[PDB]
């Protein structure tokens, strides 16, 4: 509309481009990066996980909500077009790499499932510097730590609660308490993906329609290396780590990774080892490499 | 002018915390026992004569052959393990200490001998393994502690650490003095406990003779902090033999950054890891 809006780039887009439109505006969107049949699989991969009957145990973000929270955590674990297709994807990644340029290496901090049922409210706008409270301390000139990257997997809307982003809010001083009418909205289909750089102000739209259709996303942070991953891989079974590829493995914490110099050996190492190599961890595209 | 002050192992810790802010650094005399230190000294000899691998060595291969390295002690040596790394003292300065951060872990532990002959460090700040802490404010909550223990004696000839008191409140390093350092002499037994910020130096090794000087450094940070070293490839049952604290210090446990953090850290399945791992401890029901 009136203001400056989203930009919305084929999975072609220049990568310098997409670099400098976080630094500037803070957030874009790639458009239809994920094929229909891609975002069907996951989505069907999630229902089978909604619908598994809830536990005798603890569970420690569940517990704090009512029955009716809907959170799948670790989707990678349990859906395997998320860990072998979308976790992976090639512009993804080189936005990454770009991104992280300052930083060094970056991995897979959490990615989860939320679904927002309609008559939800919208969230309260807020910077993503809660998991690693270190971030709320880090100057907007250090190097970037954190980057969020959102798929919609239904339709995001006006009027489901399509995410609303502060273009250049990554340089305020703080949050404060901005108005709805300073954002602009990420409506978006099935496919898309939504990219958020560090420190900028946004809110997820909570969902006002009323004929009971939920809005359904999931939420990827990918971290430098430096950082501590919210959710950890180290569970998975061994057969499952080694179908993947070695960014996979990578990506969930599997493998020895680099921060930037002034650290020149790395970081994830054990036995002044890599972890890789004392695991004899096999790969997928280990022959290609 | 100033000296690093030297407490008694029981001393107050509100006065350590203080030490910390004001100082940067303080020493604890005779923490550990002769016996303790004997028995990690006897470990570690036993890594040391451990014949030099044929594999990359990530951390030794850049540096000159003199270097004398042992990685993660706590996987070899159970004197560290078992007693050292959960020292009640310890850990009760790092309560204190990152009270504003949260939860705290083992990043890395590991064993450097300095031979005679060898040159003092550059004046340095502790910022290279997580370069982002080069960038966190001196105001910020502290994401880091430098712990030393001095297995051997630690003199003026063969290479005390040079510690410059007060300088974590400087906005660089600069090109400091030697002459603006103390000197953290210490017995074996002693230890040397450094802030986030504080410059100092290894002090190398001046002596013409003798057995090299011994150090185990340990760095706990923040769990918000990836861990140098990853203590997941350790067996189950050593890992099951080790206290709930010792397991919370390798990362065989989900941790609790401070508030805004609500959930915690090190998790799955929206369970707590130890719980998805069903890890038996030595002191847990
Ligand atoms: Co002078
Ligand atoms: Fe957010
Ligand atoms: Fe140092």
Same mark, same amino acid.
């Given at each position: 509309?009136?203001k400056? @809006? +989203?930009?919305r780039? &084929?999975?072609?887009?220049?990568?310098?481009?997409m670099?400098?439109?976080?630094?500037?505006?803070g957030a %874009?969107?790639?458009?239809? +990066?994920?094929?229909?049949?891609?975002?069907?699989?996951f989505?069907?991969?999630?229902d089978?996980?909604?619908a598994?009957?809830?536990?005798?145990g603890?569970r420690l973000? &569940?517990?704090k909500?009512?029955?009716?929270?809907?959170?799948?955590?670790?989707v990678?674990?349990?859906?395997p077009? %998320?860990?072998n297709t979308?976790?992976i994807? *090639?512009?993804?990644?080189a936005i990454?790499? &770009?991104?992280?340029?300052?930083?060094?290496?970056?991995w897979?901090?959490?990615?989860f499932?939320?679904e927002i049922?309609?008559?939800?409210?919208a @969230?309260?706008?807020?910077?993503?510097?809660?998991?690693?409270?270190?971030?709320?301390?880090? *100057?907007?000139?250090?190097? *970037?730590?954190? +980057?969020?990257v959102?798929?919609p997997?239904?339709?995001?809307?006006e009027?489901?609660?399509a995410?609303?982003?502060?273009?250049?809010?990554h340089r305020?001083?703080?949050?404060?308490?901005?108005?709805?009418d300073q954002?602009?909205?990420?409506?978006?289909?099935?496919?898309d993906? +939504?990219?958020?750089? @560090?420190?900028?102000?946004? &809110?997820?739209?909570?969902?006002?329609?009323?004929a009971?259709?939920?809005?359904?996303?999931?939420?990827?942070?990918?971290?430098?290396?430096q950082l501590?991953? %919210?959710?950890?891989?180290?569970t998975m079974?061994?057969?499952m780590?080694?179908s993947?590829?070695?960014?996979?493995?990578?990506m969930?914490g599997?493998?020895t990774?680099?921060?930037?110099?002034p650290?020149?050996?790395g970081?994830?190492?054990?036995?002044?080892?890599?972890?890789e190599?004392?695991?004899?961890?096999?790969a997928?595209?280990?022959?290609?490499?």
């Amino acid at each position: 509309d009136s203001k400056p @809006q +989203l930009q919305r780039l &084929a999975a072609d887009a220049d990568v310098d481009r997409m670099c400098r439109l976080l630094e500037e505006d803070g957030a %874009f969107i790639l458009k239809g +990066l994920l094929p229909f049949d891609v975002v069907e699989s996951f989505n069907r991969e999630l229902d089978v996980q909604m619908a598994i009957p809830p536990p005798k145990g603890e569970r420690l973000l &569940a517990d704090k909500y009512p029955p009716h929270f809907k959170y799948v955590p670790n989707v990678a674990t349990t859906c395997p077009t %998320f860990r072998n297709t979308v976790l992976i994807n *090639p512009v993804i990644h080189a936005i990454c790499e &770009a991104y992280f340029q300052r930083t060094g290496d970056y991995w897979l901090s959490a990615a989860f499932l939320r679904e927002i049922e309609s008559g939800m409210p919208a @969230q309260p706008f807020h910077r993503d510097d809660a998991t690693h409270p270190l971030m709320h301390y880090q *100057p907007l000139e250090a190097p *970037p730590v954190s +980057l969020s990257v959102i798929f919609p997997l239904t339709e995001f809307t006006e009027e489901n609660g399509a995410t609303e982003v502060i273009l250049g809010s990554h340089r305020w001083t703080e949050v404060g308490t901005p108005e709805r009418d300073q954002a602009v909205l990420a409506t978006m289909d099935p496919g898309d993906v +939504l990219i958020v750089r @560090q420190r900028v102000v946004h &809110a997820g739209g909570g969902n006002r329609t009323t004929a009971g259709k939920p809005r359904r996303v999931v939420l990827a942070y990918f971290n430098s290396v430096q950082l501590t991953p %919210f959710e950890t891989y180290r569970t998975m079974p061994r057969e499952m780590v080694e179908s993947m590829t070695v960014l996979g493995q990578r990506m969930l914490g599997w493998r020895t990774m680099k921060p930037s110099d002034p650290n020149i050996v790395g970081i994830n190492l054990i036995d002044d080892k890599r972890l890789e190599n004392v695991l004899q961890l096999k790969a997928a595209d280990s022959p290609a490499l």
